Amino acid sequence: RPSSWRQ
Amino acid sequence: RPSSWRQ
Amino acid sequence: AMGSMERASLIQKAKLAEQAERYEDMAAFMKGAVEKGEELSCEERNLLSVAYKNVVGGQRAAWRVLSSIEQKSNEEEKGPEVREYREKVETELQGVCDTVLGLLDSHLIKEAGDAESRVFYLKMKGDYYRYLAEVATGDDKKRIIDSARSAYQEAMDISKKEMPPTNPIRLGLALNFSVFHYEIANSPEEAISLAKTTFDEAMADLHTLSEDSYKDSTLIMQLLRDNLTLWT
Amino acid sequence: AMGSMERASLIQKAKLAEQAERYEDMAAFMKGAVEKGEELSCEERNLLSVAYKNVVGGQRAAWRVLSSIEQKSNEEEKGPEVREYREKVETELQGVCDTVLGLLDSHLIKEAGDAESRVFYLKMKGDYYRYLAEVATGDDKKRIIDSARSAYQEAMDISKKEMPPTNPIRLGLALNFSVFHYEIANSPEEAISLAKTTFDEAMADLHTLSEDSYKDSTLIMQLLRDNLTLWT
Numbered sequence A, B: 001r002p003s004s005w006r007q
Numbered sequence C, D: 001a002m003g004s005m006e007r008a009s010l011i012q013k014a015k016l017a018e019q020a021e022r023y024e025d026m027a028a029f030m031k032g033a034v035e036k037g038e039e040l041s042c043e044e045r046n047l048l049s050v051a052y053k054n055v056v057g058g059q060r061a062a063w064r065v066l067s068s069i070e071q072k073s074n075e076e077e078k079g080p081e082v083r084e085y086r087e088k089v090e091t092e093l094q095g096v097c098d099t100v101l102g103l104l105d106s107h108l109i110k111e112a113g114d115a116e117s118r119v120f121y122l123k124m125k126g127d128y129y130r131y132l133a134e135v136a137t138g139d140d141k142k143r144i145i146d147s148a149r150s151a152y153q154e155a156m157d158i159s160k161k162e163m164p165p166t167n168p169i170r171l172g173l174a175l176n177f178s179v180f181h182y183e184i185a186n187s188p189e190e191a192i193s194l195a196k197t198t199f200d201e202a203m204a205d206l207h208t209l210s211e212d213s214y215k216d217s218t219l220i221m222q223l224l225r226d227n228l229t230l231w232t
């Protein structure tokens, strides 16, 4: 699973 | 803080 | 349920809930603040986003665990319990997404005239339709996917006209739209192309930034790079 | 709310909720299972304990964050919000403790005749009164502390008569009672003495154990050692 935006 | 029981 | 609490107190308590890692409370406080009817500041938009992203993130993670167990069960018959519990978590998740989408539609988006606020809310709309799409199967699934696409596309169009290529919301929007292409729309080439062009155009604009802005932009560029490394 | 679900389905769903890290759901499923009125097996007691320990653990952590902020505020006046929100989390925490104590009193403890089950439930009773004591201030605080002490003491008396010194529940009970002495009863010497004697008596009994039991016992002995290192 790729990265969506995260802090 | 000491450790109480934990898994 | 927050109608009797002052707007400023709701915002203060949302910040305390964040510190206490009480994200359900944080989301309820921010929903109450939105329902006061005033526009949200930049900081307040961030609190709204953090709260719901953490709530729905836990639900999505749980849904994926249960969906994996259910899929393996359909390759001994254990009864209806796995499906029932997956459906329970799924319905809760859909309820949270519907709540967020309802706040955006009543009336955050229509009152958002500045590029920063409008792009922020349209990115949110794309994200929450994307989370609905992750669990969708039935007759509306194509329409759910198209709703996510349409929101992301409008946000992209505004961001390209009104923001520099290093703007953090523009970068995060492109990152999430690229994930949409890869994971939802079955368009890995579009996902890769979007991530690459976004990264390269941001790179060429870093020279204009202060040290603090440079840190903000390069952090999100690294997420784009992480996906490109995973996908290529 | 679980009255219409089969006992076995509640247990199955509690296990799924654990895998999904949905501890609130897990606790609700296990409460439903207890309310079926049958005694709980060893595995089922563990599910009950894990569920509520995780729920109340998150509440305690949040309460400590908010209490620290509140204490620092009373050393600029920010209004009633910090106290209000700390009180909200505190009331929720007390509600969960009251729920657990109510399950123990109706009717888990009175039906528990074997040493393993009775010690387990009395340890739980001590723990949940201890969590109430952590937040107590008013007229009942001494009685709350004494309720924790009394439950732990009865569990200790049974465990010393009926279980070997390496039994994991006996060790965990002694560990938690020692924490009670140190953190609640202001009796650090009693806490240290209990932890030391428990550790030493378990050490001398390890030779009787299989490799798997040895692993279980030494894991808890290490927690006793960790506290002794912190306290001495």
Ligand SMILES: *Cc1ccc(-n2ccnc2-c2ccccc2)cc1C(F)(F)F
Binding pocket: A005, C042, C045, C046, C049, C050, C120, C123, C168, C169, C171, C172, C173, C216, C220
């Ligand atoms: C989706 C998103 C992307 C980036 C950021 N972000 C990172 C660093 N600063 C910011 C920022 C963006 C917009 C306004 C203020 C700060 C945040 C977000 C999100 F908050 F999730 F929308």
Ligand SMILES: *Cc1ccc(-n2ccnc2-c2ccccc2)cc1C(F)(F)F
Binding pocket: B005, D042, D045, D046, D049, D050, D120, D123, D168, D169, D171, D172, D173, D216, D220
């Ligand atoms: C309080 C407590 C202490 C120890 C254990 N534990 C650790 C390893 N095995 C066990 C065990 C004890 C009793 C029955 C079955 C297993 C568990 C617990 C707790 F579950 F929290 F009560």
Ligand SMILES: [Ca+2]
Binding pocket: C078, C079, C080, C081, D009, D012
């Ligand atoms: Ca079944």
Ligand SMILES: [Ca+2]
Binding pocket: C039, C111, C112, C113, C114
């Ligand atoms: Ca406006």
Ligand SMILES: [Ca+2]
Binding pocket: C009, C012, D078, D079, D080, D081
């Ligand atoms: Ca205030």
Ligand SMILES: [Ca+2]
Binding pocket: D039, D111, D112, D113, D114
């Ligand atoms: Ca019995």
Ligand SMILES: [Cl-]
Binding pocket: C084, C085, C088, D013
């Ligand atoms: Cl269910």
Ligand SMILES: [Cl-]
Binding pocket: C013, D084, D085, D088
């Ligand atoms: Cl509150």
